[PDB]
């Protein structure tokens, strides 16, 4: 029940043979370190209070690692450019999601290593941590190369050692919840139609479900709803709306499901 991920982006930029490289670390989906090559002195930086106890050796080893990753992604971008026979004056994107899950028995639960090129899946390590899945024939070049070099075994060694070790260390510090405050607003829409908007504000985590019923029956089909969005103050907002006949508003109920709620909230106009 615990996770560490690294999300990496490399962006090849027209002009200057150096592409931009960003790396973001997360523990339990909370961002805890960040590296960005666009800084004056690019270096990994703490993003969680509990990372300020590490000390300079940690930061310099990790920064050196990210400067290596910057060179690795630069070369991989050039390789891929060649595989697809693309031009060199463009901007191109390589992405990376990787890391581990730590189970209740303190063992490696699952490992992850997948890449995307231009926002599309390219190659991923399979659950067995032994084989690769390639999206197209260019990714099959890369997959032949990584089978040749035994890449999966080396990464499995990282997963079973350094990854779960540092995840455990981080967990030995870095667990909060905030129920939504919900209300229904009313908006004249068409001539004899109105919009009921069901709002959920001020909740954490961001996972939530808003539903509209007409005397118990779910209206999911003809329901408009916006992506959950950050208030910018730690909490989140969402709304779902339906269009109803003017005068019938009281036959419609909104139902809000959220972790911190002792029971799902039900609301009306």
């Amino acid at each position, epitope marked *: 029940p615990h996770s560490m991920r690294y999300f990496e982006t490399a962006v090849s930029r027209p002009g200057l043979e150096e592409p931009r490289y960003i790396s973001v670390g997360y523990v339990d989906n909370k961002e805890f370190v960040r590296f960005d090559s666009d800084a004056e002195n690019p270096r990994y930086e703490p993003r969680a209070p509990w990372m300020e106890q590490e000390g300079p050796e940690y930061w310099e080893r990790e920064t050196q690692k990210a400067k290596g990753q910057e060179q690795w992604f630069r070369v991989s971008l050039r390789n891929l450019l060649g595989y697809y026979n693309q031009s060199a004056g463009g901007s191109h994107t390589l992405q990376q999601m990787s890391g581990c899950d730590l189970g*209740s028995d303190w063992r490696l639960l699952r490992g992850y290593l997948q890449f995307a090129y231009e926002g599309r899946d390219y190659i991923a390590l399979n659950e067995d941590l032994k084989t690769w899945t390639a999206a197209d024939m260019a990714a099959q070049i890369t997959r032949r190369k990584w089978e040749q070099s035994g890449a999966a075994e080396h990464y499995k060694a990282y997963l079973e050692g350094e990854c779960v070790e540092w995840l455990h260390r981080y967990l030995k510090n870095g667990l909060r919840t905030d129920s939504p405050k919900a209300h229904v607003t009313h908006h004249p829409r068409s001539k004899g139609e109105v919009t009921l908007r069901c709002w959920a504000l001020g909740f954490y985590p961001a996972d939530i*479900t808003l539903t509209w019923q007409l005397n*118990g*029956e*779910e209206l999911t089909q003809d329901m408009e709803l916006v992506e959950t969005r950050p208030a910018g103050d730690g909490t989140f907002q969402k709304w779902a709306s339906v269009v109803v006949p003017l005068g019938k508003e009281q036959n419609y109920t909104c*139902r809000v499901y959220h972790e911190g709620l002792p*029971e*799902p909230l039900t609301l009306r106009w």
Partner: antibody
Amino acid sequence: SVQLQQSGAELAKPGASVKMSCKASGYNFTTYWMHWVRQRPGQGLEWIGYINPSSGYTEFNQKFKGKATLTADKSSNTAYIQLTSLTSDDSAIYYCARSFYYFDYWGQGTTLTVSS
Amino acid sequence: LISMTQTPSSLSASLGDRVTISCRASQDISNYLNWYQQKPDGPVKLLIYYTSRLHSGVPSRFSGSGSGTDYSLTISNLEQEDIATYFCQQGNTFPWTFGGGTKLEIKR
């Protein structure tokens, strides 16, 4: 015109794990929760948990926390339940079912037998 | 977890009868009460949701009623295809919970 097609009968050794699938057709897969329900031979229905395929979010009946893992593949419109450390207690029928506080539509069920 | 009790586990009826199956929750569930039918062979279908609402497809001889902590399903004219097992389920507080059973059988 909603259909939930579940994968076929499983059978597995004690201590292994299984993955069973439920493919959703006829409706937008990510707009409804998928629930999982267990019935042991001769027993009633027990609720396992649900997954919200939009986000991958999962919630469980506390007794299945260390037993079941729920996942969704929206490119293929398919939910999955994985059970680990199988014992003879896990032999049962497993259904997937759509919606939120009621279960609109049920898969046909996947039978799992745990035997050496 | 909210406890759903049905009584009994077996009900005997004859074809043409008005069968009633009852469900009792350990606390008030605000009509978020649903009824499923499991046929002897396997398939499970929703019959009644939200105490009294007939799911589409379900013949109108199925009716649902109740409030607070007591709920009931009635079939007004028991047909052969109605000989099945019937489950109640509360949708009020997590975890969702089912009643135990009530299986129907012909009288002879």
